[PDB]
DNA sequence: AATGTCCATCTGATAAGACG
DNA sequence: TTCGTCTTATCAGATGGACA
């Protein structure tokens, strides 16, 4: 919901972030921002091996090499134990950071 | 050849919010 | 209600491939 890129006004990107104020940049213009302490000069032109689904925010890779769901992922990293087919949730749920 | 830039894509940290 | 707990978004940093 609800967030365009603050320097090139992007809609999508693999992957959002912010910079020091906390602002919304894509991926390439932030990862730009880090790096450079710099504005980013615009001018810029599967499915979990656990639960099967094909929607999630983030992919991985469990101990095996194989692509895994976000919620897969974390569950072994953190219970060294594959996560249950029981805990299947329904749709998609998020939230609100702000520093 | 050999290094540097740009960037998707992964692994890691932080912590939101559902729920006991 | 109120407050810990736990799953897992959603952030930050690491790693690598593509191109100059
Ligand atoms: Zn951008
Ligand atoms: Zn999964």
């Given at each position: 919901?609800?967030?365009?890129?603050?320097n090139c006004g992007?809609?999508?990107?693999?992957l959002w972030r912010r910079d020091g104020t906390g602002h919304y940049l894509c991926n390439a213009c932030?990862?730009?921002?880090?790096?450079?302490?710099?504005?980013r000069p615009?001018?810029?032109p599967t499915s979990?091996?656990?639960?099967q689904t094909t929607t999630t925010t983030l992919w991985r890779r469990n101990a095996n090499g194989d692509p895994v769901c976000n919620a897969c992922g974390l569950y072994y990293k953190l219970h060294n134990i594959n996560r249950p087919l029981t805990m299947k949730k329904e749709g998609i749920q998020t939230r609100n950071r702000k520093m």
């Amino acid at each position: 919901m609800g967030r365009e890129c603050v320097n090139c006004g992007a809609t999508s990107t693999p992957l959002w972030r912010r910079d020091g104020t906390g602002h919304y940049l894509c991926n390439a213009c932030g990862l730009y921002h880090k790096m450079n302490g710099q504005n980013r000069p615009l001018i810029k032109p599967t499915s979990c091996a656990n639960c099967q689904t094909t929607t999630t925010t983030l992919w991985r890779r469990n101990a095996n090499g194989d692509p895994v769901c976000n919620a897969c992922g974390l569950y072994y990293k953190l219970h060294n134990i594959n996560r249950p087919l029981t805990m299947k949730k329904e749709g998609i749920q998020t939230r609100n950071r702000k520093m």
